[PDB]
Design a protein around this ligand. Sequence first.
Ligand SMILES: *[C@@H]1O[C@H](CO)[C@@H](O[C@@H]2O[C@H](CO)[C@@H](O)[C@H](O)[C@H]2NC(C)=O)[C@H](O)[C@H]1NC(C)=O
Lengths: 49, 49
Amino acid sequence: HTVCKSKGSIRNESWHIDSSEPLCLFKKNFTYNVSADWLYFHFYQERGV
Amino acid sequence: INSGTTCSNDLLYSNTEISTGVCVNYDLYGITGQGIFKEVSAAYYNNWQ
Ligand SMILES: *[C@@H]1O[C@H](CO)[C@@H](O[C@@H]2O[C@H](CO)[C@@H](O)[C@H](O)[C@H]2NC(C)=O)[C@H](O)[C@H]1NC(C)=O
């Protein structure tokens, strides 16, 4: 399960347990407009990519 | 050694300088070919483009 820091009520953010950082291939952050109506996302894969 | 996800860019790809006048090999973002380069002022690009 995952909670959000915006006025948390009961539970806490905890979905994995890792004492060390494993080998990672991709990890990054992006920004967007905080005042919008909806957000669209599109995911797929082809030839292992 | 010779494994993991922690590598270095100390290979021949060390941010070489561009050149115009003679067609050279291309490795621009997974693309190959040859062709003369010509500087041109363009403003139809974006961040992800
Ligand atoms: C985030 O979205 C809001 C609303 O969609 C944008 O606010 C608009 O900005 C334009 C440009 O000046 C105005 O013409 C509209 O009247 C604004 N609408 C509202 C409801 O305020 C805001 O500019 C966006 N921000 C970014 C960084 O994209």
